[PDB]
Design a protein around this ligand. Sequence first.
Ligand SMILES: O=c1[nH][nH]c(=O)c2cc(OCc3cccc(Cl)c3)ccc12
Lengths: 198, 196
Amino acid sequence: NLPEHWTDMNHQLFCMVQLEPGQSEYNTIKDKFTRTCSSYAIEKIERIQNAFLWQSYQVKKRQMDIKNDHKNNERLLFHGTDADSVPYVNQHGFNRSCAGKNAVSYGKGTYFAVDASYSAKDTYSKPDSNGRKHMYVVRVLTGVFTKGRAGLVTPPPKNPHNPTDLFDSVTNNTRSPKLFVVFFDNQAYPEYLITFTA
Amino acid sequence: NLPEHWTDMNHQLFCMVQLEPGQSEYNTIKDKFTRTCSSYAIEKIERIQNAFLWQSYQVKKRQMDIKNDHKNNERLLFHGTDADSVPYVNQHGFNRSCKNAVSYGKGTYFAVDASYSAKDTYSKPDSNGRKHMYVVRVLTGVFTKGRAGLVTPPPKNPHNPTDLFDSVTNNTRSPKLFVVFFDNQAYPEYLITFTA
Ligand SMILES: O=c1[nH][nH]c(=O)c2cc(OCc3cccc(Cl)c3)ccc12
């Protein structure tokens, strides 16, 4: 079930693949980034090939496709993080118990941005001792979402009289979403790592 | 690809099935409980048929079987909870984000002995006196002693910080509880409703 554009991994379960500028795959990520981060320069873009993270994520995606009536349940979003977190995210993905409090909190989960500019803030993509900033491009199962509240540890119910039937994610604003919060493991696959500088 | 002992669900994805007293499955689960809780009264035992939870759990189990290359990664453990939490666990399983004692880390706790889970602090009696305890398949895998404040298991090797233990315990030689720190590492298989 591993994607056919992935490099052959010689029977290993994890690899970071450096992309080539001028390939469509590099250029669509570079364009998505520069749309709001034109004042930064990209050092490199790496494709994350993590067999176990992919399998768990693809099972969640297939479940949400069945549960939800004909929705586009997946969005491609950004996540800025510090260099110390990069090896953990590459191997294990996004853990809500490691997440910082957001400056505007819509719940206690993992935050993902519509715009690279948001994730490029030093508060998220902290410059390392060589001045490198790190941002992931992430497949996120946003599914059916509502406006969040600082108190949430899971997405709220769709209906107060059916407390277990939940929204898939929450946002800052349902009309004009700029961030999404997910509260479960394997609801986000880190697909690319962008290393960039001021 | 759902287990053979499950009963037909009329093409639905979630069902709680009450077991028949005196049949093999009911007797097996009743014996596990009465090993340490023979003084309690069993009202009923329900088989939890949650296709989505089962699929996500079986994926984790296949992954852990490959990674550990050995094979006894699974233990059958107990979890007492309050009646208000039962509908959530039936649908969504165990969630570390939901304060009882967490001295061995911030995960979900499971007991080796039903008697521990049977304490009123875990299986809180409801207004009709009913107590609730799950029998749980847990991917304990390779484990180490836990400690306060862990948000994931420790690494197996300090020079490889991302290769983790699968779970932690109070005591590696003679464990009485296990903590898991990830979703879909535990599948709630039966729900025992009982009284003091
Ligand atoms: O069945 C349970 N349901 N919910 C729990 O939080 C729970 C917790 C639990 O160990 C907590 C603990 C921690 C340190 C020392 C000791 Cl001695 C005990 C055991 C069972 C349960």
